């Protein structure tokens, strides 16, 4: 799967378990909402939010391909 | 894929030393700063050192300041507590662990792993 | 140290609730707070939470929230795997880490 090479790419960035997580969770499959709308539900502070938006941005580009 | 273990407990007499190693694998050692963290038989945990991914800066508890030396060897994914003048109440399982950056504070997201523990008996 | 309750309880598909109160210099200056989980004869470890809702707004199994000098874990759900001690932390400026003494959940019939 080359967007969970992707993804695990873009993680490898992030340092902390935590928000590593943050990642995972931003590219996982949302139909209903925009990661934007997703990300300012978020209470886990700029680090988290910085690497869900990432991976979220990313997650979605991809699979519109 | 990221494992530490500990390593060089025992029994030790009072007024004697005794040195930890943890080793690491599976994250860039040097980019993480790493702590010591104690358990006592029963009890509750409590920090005893941290360390700096470059190892610039090192911090110790009120009780072991002054004994315990902690270090690293980025070189061989290595962690090191030297600890001495050990008394009856330094008894306990030593976990070593991979800390967040406390410079990101008020969103310090704490110990993301840990080692097995290693007992150390003084008596 | 950190102040929690000594243990707490309840029966499986309950929510629990464990209290961590510290001072103005620690959890107080603090605007998330770590948790971790030791299982009997194990490590600690981190609590990790998940950043997506479930759909229907059914509670995450394990949230967190903090406000002014106390935190709480919240454990929704309740499984008999959840059995273990519960451990709150903080950063401290002269003290450098601190932990809470510990709760002991306990999931009864």
């Known amino acids: 799967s080359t967007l969970q090479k992707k993804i695990e790419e873009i993680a490898a960035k992030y340092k902390h378990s935590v928000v590593k997580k943050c990642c995972y969770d931003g590219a996982c499959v949302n139909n209903d909402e925009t990661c934007e709308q997703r990300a300012a539900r978020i209470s886990l502070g700029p680090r988290c939010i910085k690497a869900f938006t990432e991976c979220c941005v990313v997650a979605s580009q991809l699979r519109a391909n | 894929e990221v494992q530490l273990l500990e390593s060089g407990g025992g029994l030790v007499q009072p007024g004697g030393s005794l040195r930890l190693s943890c080793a690491a694998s599976?994250?860039?050692?040097?980019?993480?700063?790493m702590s010591w963290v104690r358990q006592a038989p029963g009890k509750g945990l409590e920090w005893v050192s941290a360390?700096?991914?470059?190892?610039?800066?090192?911090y110790y508890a009120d009780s072991v300041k002054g004994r315990f030396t902690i270090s690293r060897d980025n070189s061989k994914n290595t962690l090191y507590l030297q600890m001495n003048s050990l008394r009856a109440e330094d008894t306990a399982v030593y976990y070593c662990?991979?800390?967040?950056?406390?410079?990101?504070?008020?969103?310090?997201?704490?110990?993301?792993?840990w080692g097995q523990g290693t007992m150390v008996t003084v008596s | 140290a950190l102040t929690q309750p000594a243990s707490v309880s309840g029966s499986p598909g309950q929510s629990i609730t464990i209290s961590c109160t510290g001072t103005?210099?620690?959890?107080?200056?603090?605007?998330?707070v770590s948790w971790y989980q030791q299982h009997p004869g194990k490590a600690p470890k981190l609590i990790i939470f998940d950043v997506n809702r479930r759909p229907s707004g059914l509670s995450n199994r394990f949230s967190a929230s903090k406000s002014g000098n106390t935190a709480s874990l919240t454990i929704s759900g309740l499984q008999a795997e959840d059995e273990a001690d519960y451990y709150c932390?903080?950063?401290?400026?002269?003290?450098?880490?601190?932990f809470g003494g510990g709760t002991k959940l306990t999931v009864l019939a």
């Open positions: 360390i700096s991914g470059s190892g610039g800066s090192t």
């Open positions: 932390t903080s950063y401290h400026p002269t003290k450098t880490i601190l």
């Open positions: 103005s210099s620690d959890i107080g200056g603090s605007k998330y």
């Open positions: 599976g994250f860039t050692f040097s980019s993480y700063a």
């Open positions: 662990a991979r800390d967040d950056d406390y410079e990101e504070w008020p969103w310090y997201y704490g110990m993301d792993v």
